[PDB]
Amino acid sequence: PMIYICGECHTENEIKSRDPIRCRECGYRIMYKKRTKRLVVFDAR
Amino acid sequence: VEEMRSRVVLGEFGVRNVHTTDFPGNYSGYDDAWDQDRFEKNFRVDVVHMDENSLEFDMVGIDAAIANAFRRILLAEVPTMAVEKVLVYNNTSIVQDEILAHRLGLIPIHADPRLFEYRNQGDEEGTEIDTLQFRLQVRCTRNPHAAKDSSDPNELYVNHKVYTRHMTWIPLGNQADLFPEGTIRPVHDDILIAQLRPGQEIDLLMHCVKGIGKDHAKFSPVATASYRLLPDITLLEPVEGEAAEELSRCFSPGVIEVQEVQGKKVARVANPRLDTFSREIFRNEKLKKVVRLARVRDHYIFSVESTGVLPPDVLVSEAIKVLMGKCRRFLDELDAV
Amino acid sequence: MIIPVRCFTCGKIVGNKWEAYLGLLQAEYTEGDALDALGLKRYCCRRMLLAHVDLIEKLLNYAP
Amino acid sequence: GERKTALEMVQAAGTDRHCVTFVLHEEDHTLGNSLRYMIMKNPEVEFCGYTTTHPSESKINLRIQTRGTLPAVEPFQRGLNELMNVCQHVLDKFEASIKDYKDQKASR
Ligand SMILES: [Zn+2]
Ligand SMILES: [Zn+2]
Incomplete structure (x- = not known):
């Protein structure tokens, strides 16, 4: 369930191995990975 | 043969001396x-004011x-x-994670630090004794009940602006007792x-530890705690006749109160404490010879303003x-x- | 970008006077009267609001 | 108690008890300057001076050179006591004044 948001459509595309990297509902060629809930620790200094 | 025991005299081109002559051997007899x-x-x-978050006591008769x-x-x-x-579980905001x-870190917490203790070195976990945990979890949604409007609060708004109200305390241990609900x-x-x-969406857990304002400013409990020596103003000559008003304008306005003793107008030094040192008489060229302004030797004025963690008097006591x-x-x- | 939480030189907390400042300026008050009515006495705090440029409102306009 | 967050004393050349340099760790100009002011009031000390060794470090050096008799560790231990007495008196006086002002203001 690796999601990628389109560049201007903003549709969640899930891509894999061996498949092209175009976007559904459009045809753009740039897609940003999505932020999942993972724990990271930062210091307030 | 003239002693001045109590004031720090001053002109314009510089102050006269940096001593107070109240130490051992500093005089023939005044040892x-x-x-x-x-x-x-x-x-x-002596305390001039004590609102909440302010104090202005005097502290007369102590060294610098x-x-x-x-x-x-x-x-x-x-x-x-x-x-x-x-600890940031998700953060899809424009504001970065480190920022x-x-x-x-710079948000002041109302816990009193005297009921807690310092986390031992490498105590990452923490316990009821040394830590407080708070949680901010907010998500912004469009409100369904909105017309074609553009005020950001009316539409595009369930949580447009994340405030300190959104932060919720997670009682860590037995701290729910000891600390009542709103404390x-x-x-x-x-x-x-x-x-x-x-x-x-923002989603995070914040851990608050004890510390002093010396290793990081975030832990400092006062906006400012400075002090100033009590000014001293002396009219060497009776100023009168429309020069009294020019005198009263060369000072913070309350300091020289121009009375009307006779038909003529006399200027008098009503309240020397209000004076801010601006040395604007020294630009007058005719009244720089009439007034001597210096400082009282060991008479201070303090001003403590807390952020809100503890009251100012308690701050001074703990200092x-x-x-x-x-x-x-x-x-x-x-x-x- | 966003209002600093504490004044840099002193530490006084000015991060809660942004919306109040904006509201007193919409009511017709000068920046001087407005900064006075908020409790910003010393000019180190007054510069913290007087010269703030809210660029979080221009970044919050490009797509999600 | 603490072997080095506190005192390290270096007796001078010849280990002159009348000339000692105390190293006080985790201290800045606050205690240094107040304690030097309190030790200068003793007529039995001929030279008292403190100094910070380096900005990066957190420690001060006091130098007490007393007169011929006392070992220069009594002037230090007496300046400490007089400073703590002054702090206790200031605390008492300040709390009493705050209480009096609170009453005067709550009555009226
Ligand atoms: Zn698309
Ligand atoms: Zn400030």
Whole structure:
């Protein structure tokens, strides 16, 4: 369930191995990975 | 053959001297061996104001070294509680993660630091004894009940602006007892933490530890705690006849009160304390010879303004006690030999 | 970008006077009267609001 | 108690008890300057001076050179006591004044 948001459509595309990297509902060629809930620790200094 | 025992005289091109002549051997007879009773007799504390978050006591009759010790204790050695670690589960905001952690560290918490203790080195976990945990979890959604409008609060708004109200205390241990429901909270409920747009979410856990304003400013409990020596203004000559008003304008306005003793107008020094040193008489060229303005020797004026963690009087008390604790620590380490 | 939480030189907390400042300026008050009505006495705090440029409102306008 | 967050004493050339340099760790100009002011009031000390060794470090050096008799460790241990007495008196006086002002203001 690796999601990628389109560049201007903003549709969640899930891509894999061996498949092209175009976007559904459009045809753009740039897609940003999505932020999942993972724990990271930062210091307030 | 003329002694001036109490004032720090001053002109324009520089101040005259940096001494106070109240130490051992500093005079033929006016020698000192630290008479404790003379101190306890000549010392007096007077408070000009005490709103909440303000104090303006006087502290008459103490040296500059002790006053400066008190001032430096309030700024950098009285302990406070503040966010040290931030665990970020998700953060789809425009504000970065490190910048969010920074902004969260500088938010003042209302926990009193005297009921807590310092986390031992490498105590990452923490316990009811040394830590407080708070949670901010907010998501922005469009409101379904909105017309074609553009005010950001009316539409595009369930949580457009994340405030300190959104932060919720997670009682860590038995701290729910000991601390009643409203006692442990951020001091201000309106501090803007971030801004969100529909679909954006913040979710994090903040850990607050104890510390002094010396190793980081976030832990400092006062806006400012400075002091100023009491000004002294003396009219060497009776100013009158429309020069009294020019005199009254060369000073902070309350200092020279122009009375009307006769048909003519006399200027009198009503309240020397209001004076800000602006030395604007020294530009007058005819009245720089009439007024002498200096400072009272050991008469201070303090002003402590807390952020909201503790009241100012409690802050001053804990500062004096921190100085006493330094002295006692070194006394007892000396007695260890 | 967003209002600093505490004034840099002093530490006084000014992060809660942004919306109040904006509201007193919409009511017709000068920046001087407005900064006075908020409790910002010393000019180190007054510069913290007087010269703030809210660029979080221009970044919060490009797509999600 | 603490072997080095506190005192390290260096007796001078010839280990002159009348000339000692105390190293006080975790201290800045606050205690240094107040304690030097309190030790200067003793007529039995001929030279008292403190100094910070380096900004990066957190420690001060006091130098007490007393007169012929006393070992220069009594002037230090007496300046400490007088400073703590002054702090206790200031605390008492300040709390009494705050209480009096609170009453005067709550009555009226
Ligand atoms: Zn698309
Ligand atoms: Zn300020």
